[PDB]
Coordinates of C-alpha atoms and ligand atoms in Angstrom, one line a residue:
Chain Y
X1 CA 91.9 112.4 89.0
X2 CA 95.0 110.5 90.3
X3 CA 98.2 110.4 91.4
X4 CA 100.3 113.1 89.3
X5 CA 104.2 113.3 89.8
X6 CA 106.8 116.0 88.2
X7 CA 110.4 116.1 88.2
X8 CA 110.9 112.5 88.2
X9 CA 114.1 112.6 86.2
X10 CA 113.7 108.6 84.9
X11 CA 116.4 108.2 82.3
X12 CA 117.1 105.7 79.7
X13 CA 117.6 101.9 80.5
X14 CA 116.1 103.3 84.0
X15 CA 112.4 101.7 85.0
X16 CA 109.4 103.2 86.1
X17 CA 107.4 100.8 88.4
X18 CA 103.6 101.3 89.4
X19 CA 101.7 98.7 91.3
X20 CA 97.5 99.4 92.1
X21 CA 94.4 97.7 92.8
X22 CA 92.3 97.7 89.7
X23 CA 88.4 98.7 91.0
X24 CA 86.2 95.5 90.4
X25 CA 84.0 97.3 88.7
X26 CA 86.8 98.8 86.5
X27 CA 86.2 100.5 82.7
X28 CA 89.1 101.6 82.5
X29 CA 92.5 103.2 83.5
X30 CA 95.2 105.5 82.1
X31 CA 99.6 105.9 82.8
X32 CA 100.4 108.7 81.2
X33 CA 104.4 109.4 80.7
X34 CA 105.7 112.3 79.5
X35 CA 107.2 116.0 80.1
X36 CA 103.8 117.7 81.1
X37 CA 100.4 117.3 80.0
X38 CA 100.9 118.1 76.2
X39 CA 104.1 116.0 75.7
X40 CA 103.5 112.1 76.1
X41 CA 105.9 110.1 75.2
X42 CA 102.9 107.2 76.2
X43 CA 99.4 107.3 76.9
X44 CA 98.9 104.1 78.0
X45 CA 95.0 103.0 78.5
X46 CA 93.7 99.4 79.8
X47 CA 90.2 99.4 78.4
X48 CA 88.0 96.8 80.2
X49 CA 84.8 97.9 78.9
X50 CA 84.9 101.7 77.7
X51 CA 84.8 103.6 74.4
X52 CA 83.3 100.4 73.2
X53 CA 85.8 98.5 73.8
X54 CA 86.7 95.0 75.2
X55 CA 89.8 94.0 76.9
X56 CA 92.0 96.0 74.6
X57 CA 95.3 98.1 75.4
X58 CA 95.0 101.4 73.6
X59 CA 98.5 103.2 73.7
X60 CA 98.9 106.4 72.0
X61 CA 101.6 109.5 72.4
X62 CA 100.7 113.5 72.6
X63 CA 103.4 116.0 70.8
X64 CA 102.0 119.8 71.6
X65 CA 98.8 119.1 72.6
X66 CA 98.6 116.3 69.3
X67 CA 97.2 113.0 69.9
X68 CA 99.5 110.8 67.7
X69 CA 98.6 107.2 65.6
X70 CA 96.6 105.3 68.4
X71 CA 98.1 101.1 68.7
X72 CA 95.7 98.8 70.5
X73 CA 98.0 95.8 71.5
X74 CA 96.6 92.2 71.3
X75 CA 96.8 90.9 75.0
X76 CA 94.7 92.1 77.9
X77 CA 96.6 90.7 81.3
X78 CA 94.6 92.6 83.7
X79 CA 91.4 91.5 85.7
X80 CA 89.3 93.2 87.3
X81 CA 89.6 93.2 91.1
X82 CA 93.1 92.8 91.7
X83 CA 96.3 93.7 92.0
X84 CA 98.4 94.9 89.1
X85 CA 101.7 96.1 88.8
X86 CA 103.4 97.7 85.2
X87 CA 107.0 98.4 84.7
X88 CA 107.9 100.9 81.8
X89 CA 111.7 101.2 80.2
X90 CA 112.7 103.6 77.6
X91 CA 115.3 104.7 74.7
X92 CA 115.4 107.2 72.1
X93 CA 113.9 104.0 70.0
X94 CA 110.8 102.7 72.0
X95 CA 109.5 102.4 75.2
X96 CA 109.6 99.1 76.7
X97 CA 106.2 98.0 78.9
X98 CA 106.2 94.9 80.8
X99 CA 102.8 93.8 82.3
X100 CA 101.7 90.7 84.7
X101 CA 101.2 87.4 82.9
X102 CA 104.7 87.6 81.5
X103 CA 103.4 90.1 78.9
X104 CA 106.1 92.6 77.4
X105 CA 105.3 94.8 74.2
X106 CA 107.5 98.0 72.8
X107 CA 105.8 101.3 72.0
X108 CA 108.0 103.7 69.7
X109 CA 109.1 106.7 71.3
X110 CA 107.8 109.4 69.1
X111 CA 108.7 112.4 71.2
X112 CA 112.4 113.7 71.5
X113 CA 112.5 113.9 75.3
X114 CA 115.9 113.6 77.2
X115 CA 114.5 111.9 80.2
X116 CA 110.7 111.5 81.2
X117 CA 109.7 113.9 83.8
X118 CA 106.2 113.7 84.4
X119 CA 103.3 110.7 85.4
X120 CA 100.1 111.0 85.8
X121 CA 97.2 108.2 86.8
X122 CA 93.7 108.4 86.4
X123 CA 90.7 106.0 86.0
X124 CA 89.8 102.7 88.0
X125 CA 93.5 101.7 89.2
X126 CA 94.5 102.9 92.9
X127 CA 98.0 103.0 92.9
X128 CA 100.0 101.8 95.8
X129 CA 103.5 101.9 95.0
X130 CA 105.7 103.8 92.6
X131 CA 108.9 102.8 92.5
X132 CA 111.7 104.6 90.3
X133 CA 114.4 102.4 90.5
Chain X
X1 CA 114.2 119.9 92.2
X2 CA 113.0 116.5 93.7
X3 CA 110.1 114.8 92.5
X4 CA 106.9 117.1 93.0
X5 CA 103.9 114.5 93.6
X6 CA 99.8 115.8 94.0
X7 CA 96.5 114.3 94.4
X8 CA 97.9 112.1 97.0
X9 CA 95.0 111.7 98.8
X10 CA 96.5 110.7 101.8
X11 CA 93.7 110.5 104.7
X12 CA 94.0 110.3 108.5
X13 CA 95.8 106.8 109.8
X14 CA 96.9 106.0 106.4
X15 CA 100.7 105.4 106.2
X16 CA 102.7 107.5 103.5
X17 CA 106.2 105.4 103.3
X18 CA 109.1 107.5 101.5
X19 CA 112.3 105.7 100.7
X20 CA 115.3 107.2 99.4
X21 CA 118.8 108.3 98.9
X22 CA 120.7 110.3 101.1
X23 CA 123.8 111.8 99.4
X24 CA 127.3 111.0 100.2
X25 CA 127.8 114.9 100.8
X26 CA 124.5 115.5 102.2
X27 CA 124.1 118.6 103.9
X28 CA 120.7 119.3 104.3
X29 CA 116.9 117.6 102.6
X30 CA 113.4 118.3 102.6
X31 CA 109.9 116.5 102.5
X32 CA 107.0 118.5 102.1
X33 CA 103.6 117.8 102.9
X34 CA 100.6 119.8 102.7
X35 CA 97.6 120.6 100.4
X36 CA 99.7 122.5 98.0
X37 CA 103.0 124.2 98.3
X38 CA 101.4 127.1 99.6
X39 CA 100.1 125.4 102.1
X40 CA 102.4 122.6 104.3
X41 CA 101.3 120.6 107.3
X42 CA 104.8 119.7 107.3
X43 CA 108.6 121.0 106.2
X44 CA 110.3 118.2 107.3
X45 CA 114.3 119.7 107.1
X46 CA 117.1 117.3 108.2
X47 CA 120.1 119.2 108.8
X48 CA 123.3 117.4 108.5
X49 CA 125.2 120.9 108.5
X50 CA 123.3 123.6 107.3
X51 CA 122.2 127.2 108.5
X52 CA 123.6 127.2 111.7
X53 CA 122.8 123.5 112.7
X54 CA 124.4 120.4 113.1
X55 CA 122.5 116.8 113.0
X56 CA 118.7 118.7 113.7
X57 CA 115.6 117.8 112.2
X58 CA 113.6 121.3 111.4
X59 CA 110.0 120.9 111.3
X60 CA 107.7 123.7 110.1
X61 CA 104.4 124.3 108.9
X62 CA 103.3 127.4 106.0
X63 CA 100.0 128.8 106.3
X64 CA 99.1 130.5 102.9
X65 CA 102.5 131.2 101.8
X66 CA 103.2 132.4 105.3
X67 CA 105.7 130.0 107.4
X68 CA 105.1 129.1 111.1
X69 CA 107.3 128.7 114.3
X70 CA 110.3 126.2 113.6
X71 CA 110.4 123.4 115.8
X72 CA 113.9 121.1 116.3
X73 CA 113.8 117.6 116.9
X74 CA 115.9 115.5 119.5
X75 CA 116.7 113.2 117.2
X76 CA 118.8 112.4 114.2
X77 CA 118.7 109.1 113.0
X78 CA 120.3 109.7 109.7
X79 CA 123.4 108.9 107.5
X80 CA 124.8 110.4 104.6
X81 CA 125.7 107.9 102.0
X82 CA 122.5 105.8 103.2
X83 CA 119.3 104.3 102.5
X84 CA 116.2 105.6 104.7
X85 CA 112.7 105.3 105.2
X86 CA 110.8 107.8 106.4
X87 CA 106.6 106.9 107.5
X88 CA 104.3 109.6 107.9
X89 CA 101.0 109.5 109.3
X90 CA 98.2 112.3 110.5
X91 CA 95.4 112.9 112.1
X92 CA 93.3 115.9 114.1
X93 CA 95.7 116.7 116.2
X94 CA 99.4 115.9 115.0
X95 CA 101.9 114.2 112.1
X96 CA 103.6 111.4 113.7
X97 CA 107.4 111.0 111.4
X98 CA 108.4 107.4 111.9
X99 CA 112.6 107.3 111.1
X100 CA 115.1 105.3 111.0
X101 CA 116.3 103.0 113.8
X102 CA 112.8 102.7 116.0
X103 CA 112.8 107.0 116.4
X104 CA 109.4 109.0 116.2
X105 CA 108.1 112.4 117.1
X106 CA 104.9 114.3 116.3
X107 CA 104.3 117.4 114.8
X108 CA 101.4 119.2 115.3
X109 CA 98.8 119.9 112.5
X110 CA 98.4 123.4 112.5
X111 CA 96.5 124.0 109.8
X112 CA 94.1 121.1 110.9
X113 CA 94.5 119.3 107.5
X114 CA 92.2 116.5 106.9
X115 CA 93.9 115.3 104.1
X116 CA 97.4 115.8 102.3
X117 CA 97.5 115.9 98.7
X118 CA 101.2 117.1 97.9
X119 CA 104.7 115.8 98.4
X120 CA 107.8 118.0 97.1
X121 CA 111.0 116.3 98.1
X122 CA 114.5 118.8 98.0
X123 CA 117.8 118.7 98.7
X124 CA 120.3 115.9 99.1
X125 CA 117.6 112.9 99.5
X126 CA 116.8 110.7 96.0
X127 CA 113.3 109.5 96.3
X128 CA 113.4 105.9 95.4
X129 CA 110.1 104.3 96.3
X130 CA 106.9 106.2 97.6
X131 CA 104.3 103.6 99.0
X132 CA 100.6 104.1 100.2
X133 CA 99.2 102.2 103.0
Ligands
WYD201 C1 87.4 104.5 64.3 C2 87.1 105.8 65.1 C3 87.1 105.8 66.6 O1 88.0 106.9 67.0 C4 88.0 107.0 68.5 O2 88.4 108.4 68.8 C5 88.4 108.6 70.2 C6 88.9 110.1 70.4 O3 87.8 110.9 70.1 C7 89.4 107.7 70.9 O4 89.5 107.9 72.3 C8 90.6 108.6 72.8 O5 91.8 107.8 72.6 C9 92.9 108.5 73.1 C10 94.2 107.8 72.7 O6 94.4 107.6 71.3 C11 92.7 108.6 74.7 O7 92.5 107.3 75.3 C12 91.5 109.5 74.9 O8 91.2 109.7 76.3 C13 92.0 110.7 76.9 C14 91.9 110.6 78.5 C15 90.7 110.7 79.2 N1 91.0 110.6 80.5 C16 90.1 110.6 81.7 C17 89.8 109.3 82.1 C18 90.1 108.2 81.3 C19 89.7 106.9 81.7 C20 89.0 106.8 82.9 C21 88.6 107.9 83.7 C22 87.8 107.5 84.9 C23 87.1 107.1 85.9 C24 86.4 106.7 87.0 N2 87.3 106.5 88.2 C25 89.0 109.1 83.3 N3 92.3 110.4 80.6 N4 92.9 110.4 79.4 C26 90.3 108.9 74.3 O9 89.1 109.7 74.5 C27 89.1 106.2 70.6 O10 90.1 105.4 71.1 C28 89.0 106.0 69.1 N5 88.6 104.6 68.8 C29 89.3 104.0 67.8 C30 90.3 104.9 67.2 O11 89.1 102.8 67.5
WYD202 C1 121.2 131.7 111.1 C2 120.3 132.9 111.5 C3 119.0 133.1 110.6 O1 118.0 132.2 111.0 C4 117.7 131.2 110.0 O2 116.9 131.8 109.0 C5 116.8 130.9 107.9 C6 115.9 131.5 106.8 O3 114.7 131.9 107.2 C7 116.1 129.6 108.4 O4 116.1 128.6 107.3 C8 114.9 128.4 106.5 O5 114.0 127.6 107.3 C9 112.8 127.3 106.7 C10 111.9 126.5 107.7 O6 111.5 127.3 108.8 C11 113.2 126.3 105.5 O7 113.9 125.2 106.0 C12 114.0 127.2 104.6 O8 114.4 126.4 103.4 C13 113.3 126.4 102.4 C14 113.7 125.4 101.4 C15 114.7 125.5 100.5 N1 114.7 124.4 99.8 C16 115.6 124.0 98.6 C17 116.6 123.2 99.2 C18 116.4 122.2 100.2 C19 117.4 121.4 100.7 C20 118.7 121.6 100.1 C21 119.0 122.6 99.1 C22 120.2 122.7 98.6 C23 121.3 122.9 98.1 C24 122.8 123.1 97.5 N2 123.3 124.4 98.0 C25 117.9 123.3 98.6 N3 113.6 123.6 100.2 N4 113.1 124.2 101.2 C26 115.3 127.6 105.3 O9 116.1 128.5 104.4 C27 116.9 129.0 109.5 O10 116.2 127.8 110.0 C28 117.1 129.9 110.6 N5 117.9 129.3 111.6 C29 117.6 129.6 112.9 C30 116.4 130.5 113.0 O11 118.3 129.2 113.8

């Protein structure tokens, strides 16, 4: 299990910015964003090969221990084997997530949190930097 | 009230690189380090003016909930109303606190950590950036 970070206080229009190595052999990583472990605002998981799955963003939000309507987004700018760095905005309307490979998509905000407190990382995606701000 | 980070997994030689915020008023900020908040290799306690001292780094270790012998620093290499960087690396014997301006000192590792899983910053430093190396 990876990084996890509480209290991190990121309000609106401010950016959340994560840089890792993804594993070469990578199946798969997770961002999850939030208030705690129950409350995500966004799941966010890179699928290289896992669940099935192909090269697919799967993003989904958790409301009281709820998995919401899973989105799989249509543009995969990760490789394995390298370096990857994600940058994640948010208002009470969506969250914004801008990836390498010029590659920007909104997820709505489902959750009614005043700022996101909580990160956590897991899966094949070392993280080097977090910047908040 | 700072941002709480775990499953570091910070390992001997590698550089842990905190950049913050030190308030315009500051009095007084902590970094933690340890395997838990239990159980800290290092209180790292600038003092700008704050029980008793003036411009003193505090350094102490906790033991099971159990605090050690403070130790004060020669050296105070901070501003409030500034930017600063503070490196951290450990091994066997000691920490070794890289600051601001080309200072250093080491701390020893009394609870002969091999690896340090948990940050908790505190006080009048906004963490900013948190890099692994
Ligand atoms: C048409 C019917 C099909 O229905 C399927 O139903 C499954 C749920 O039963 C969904 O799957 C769930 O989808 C959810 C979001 O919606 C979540 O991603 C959740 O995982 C949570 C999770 C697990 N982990 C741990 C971890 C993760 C990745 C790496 C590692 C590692 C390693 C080595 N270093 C560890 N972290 N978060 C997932 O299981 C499928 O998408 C879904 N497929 C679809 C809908 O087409
Ligand atoms: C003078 C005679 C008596 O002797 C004093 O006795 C005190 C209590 O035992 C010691 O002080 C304790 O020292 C310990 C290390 O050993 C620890 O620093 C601990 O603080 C834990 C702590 C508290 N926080 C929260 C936080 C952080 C920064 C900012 C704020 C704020 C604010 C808006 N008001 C809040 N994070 N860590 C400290 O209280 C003094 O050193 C000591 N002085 C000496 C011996 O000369």
């Amino acid at each position: 299990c990876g990084l996890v970070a509480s209290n991190l206080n990121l309000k609106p229009g401010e950016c959340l910015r994560v840089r890792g190595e993804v594993a070469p052999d990578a199946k798969s990583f997770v961002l999850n964003l939030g208030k705690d472990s129950n409350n995500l605002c966004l799941h966010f998981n890179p699928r290289f090969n896992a669940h099935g799955d192909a090269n697919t963003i799967v993003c989904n939000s958790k409301d009281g221990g709820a998995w919401g309507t899973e989105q799989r987004e249509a543009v995969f700018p990760f490789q394995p084997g390298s370096v990857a760095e994600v940058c994640i905005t948010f208002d009470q309307a969506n969250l914004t997530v801008k990836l390498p490979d010029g590659y920007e998509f909104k997820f709505p905000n489902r959750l009614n949190l005043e700022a996101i407190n909580y990160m956590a990382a897991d899966g094949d995606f070392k993280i080097k930097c977090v910047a908040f701000d």
